Design a protein around this ligand. Sequence first.
Ligand SMILES: *[C@@H]1O[C@H](CO)[C@@H](O)[C@H](O)[C@H]1NC(C)=O
Ligand SMILES: *[C@@H]1O[C@H](CO)[C@@H](O)[C@H](O)[C@H]1NC(C)=O
Ligand SMILES: *[C@@H]1O[C@H](CO)[C@@H](O)[C@H](O)[C@H]1NC(C)=O
Lengths: 374, 365
Amino acid sequence: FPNTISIGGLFMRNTVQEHSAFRFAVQLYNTNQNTTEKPFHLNYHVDHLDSSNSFSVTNAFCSQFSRGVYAIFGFYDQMSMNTLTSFCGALHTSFVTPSFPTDADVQFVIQMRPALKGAILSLLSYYKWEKFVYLYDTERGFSVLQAIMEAAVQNNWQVTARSVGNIKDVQEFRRIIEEMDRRQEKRYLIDCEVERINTILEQVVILGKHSRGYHYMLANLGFTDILLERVMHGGANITGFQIVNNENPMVQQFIQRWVRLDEREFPEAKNAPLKYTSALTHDAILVIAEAFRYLRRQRVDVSGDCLANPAVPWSQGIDIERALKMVQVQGMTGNIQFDTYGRRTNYTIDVYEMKVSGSRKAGYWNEYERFVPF
Amino acid sequence: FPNTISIGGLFMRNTVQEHSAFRFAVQLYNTPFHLNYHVDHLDSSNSFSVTNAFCSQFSRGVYAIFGFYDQMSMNTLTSFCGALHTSFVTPSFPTDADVQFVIQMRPALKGAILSLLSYYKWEKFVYLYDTERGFSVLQAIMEAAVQNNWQVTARSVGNIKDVQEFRRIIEEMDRRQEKRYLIDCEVERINTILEQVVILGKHSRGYHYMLANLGFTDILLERVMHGGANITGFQIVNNENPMVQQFIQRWVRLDEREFPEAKNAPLKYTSALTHDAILVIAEAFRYLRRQRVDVSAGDCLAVPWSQGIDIERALKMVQVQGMTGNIQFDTYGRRTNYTIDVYEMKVSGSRKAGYWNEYERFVPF
Ligand SMILES: *[C@@H]1O[C@H](CO)[C@@H](O)[C@H](O)[C@H]1NC(C)=O
Ligand SMILES: *[C@@H]1O[C@H](CO)[C@@H](O)[C@H](O)[C@H]1NC(C)=O
Ligand SMILES: *[C@@H]1O[C@H](CO)[C@@H](O)[C@H](O)[C@H]1NC(C)=O
């Protein structure tokens, strides 16, 4: 078994804090000092990529693959996801990612980020929403959208659904709200990127009269980076979701070390709160470390060109993929386990409610117990 | 400008007749550039064989790919075309979301369905659906039910695997006094439902079935029609169109060994769209030649990229009259300015009850 295990890191725009977390988590692994916990050294090579440019993506990918990385940690968005996941699959290279989990059932992709679909439906059922607005963009896939629409027609809900991902003129957000008023809409499910939730909540405020008696369910694990203070001061109900428990001892010990870090070597550590994707980035290193300690323990002998059409041995990379998907470890995002398609399984999503009465953790959700209120 | 234009053909399960229509439409065009193609068959049950199919076609160096997707292979196939700038031309269901580099031969059906629910003043009905043609119709029904305060009882039936279970759903709907059905399912599944409607008895007279599927001519609705039920269907092929008759006349005369499904089954509308795709392709490449764009190979992961923009634009710019009527596309590759014919079959008889287009909406005769 090699002394050093090298991995790739594919980063994009606006993954600066995650890149620092990736660097800090790898460092933490390397320091120590425990023979059993650190039986090899973890190296990496990092490329930045412009997802808007396909050659930029395949280029970054081939660079890594052709250095002989044992795995690639990385990000994708809607433009690059298919290229990136399809090539990892064709080349049998394990891709570990905090990005939105793929709609398709795919191989060689370890998805650090848990599905939100189950938790949202359980909560809609809990609140008994049978009439509501659903504002959505498509940056995290079509899985929530399709489940909502099917639930709506099957359950006789009245869902007014509006796509808002292509909106650039913030005025348009205003008009849509006014249009929702004509249907006496008080309840909004917002399935959008954080940045876009922020823009919508700013318009609700600028517009006025859309806080008291309103309820906004924010379908995004990035709950902590959402700016909702002004909406909350107006009387609104807000529901959100998180997978990082600030009371968790592991989250705590990570945070204490993390906020001391220098802003030049680790940008975004001191000037912004820890994004949940930075926690998922940390936990990815735990998963990788654990997978590879396992392979080492089994005396596995870990074994081309960046080309699709020419072949690829069937059993290649299978050993690593399995080792990654069989891990059960406790991280900053709780219990971490994967199913055969690399999806988080047996995970917990914490549910938060903000009301004029105050702000609190209102329960938790898991696949077996569904929503448990507290 | 090359004399020979090469295209790929990506064929699936249950596209035999379309494959024969493809080969024949190309032959007709060839018998001034010449059309070559290479076929790959595809299994969509893996996100893997899909990537493999597209990559093989891509490495041959084709100028466009004619082919099919299903709900499973759709995102991966169309995404590859968009990323590698290779135009995909297809009779498959039009994509729910706006995509680039996908020319969709098949027009949206939702406008026509809504226009007709209004014409009939349906306010309470059953909505049976599978998701094999996307969510576009389902979403438009959801929206319209809210907008007009409809009382829609909706059941998903795509996953039903025992035909007996369809009788059970129909009975439940009887307890709700349902007489009006909107069926948004594959043709095969529609045939199964109508067979269960018949077997059940007493569900013809008094009932009205609106069949949301452009494969109207493949629906077996004779027994149901003899019982007194109302049926409404939709088509995009006019069998009285000279061009359709001329194609058919030569097509039924092909030997069954080389052209399977021409003699033992009526032309599917998807086979007509397949013929129309060759029309669109031939016209697009006449444009590019006229523009003096030169179109004269590597691996998926390695200029024919730079030309893709122009090919895609030529395709989407064409206007041609085909077996499916006027053919034009918008910036997202969706049919535009198309006509849908509406057929109703009553106890009084069967007839084209009018046509629907985006501007006039439904125009009864
Ligand atoms: C907001 O929460 C309150 C407190 O439970 C609830 O009773 C009310 O119905 C909610 N508002 C809306 C619009 O649902
Ligand atoms: C899920 O995780 C819990 C807590 O980590 C663990 O004890 C249990 O083994 C897991 N359950 C299943 C069903 O895998
Ligand atoms: C069927 O057809 C006639 C129109 O000729 C119509 O009035 C009747 O209401 C329709 N039947 C049903 C069940 O809706």
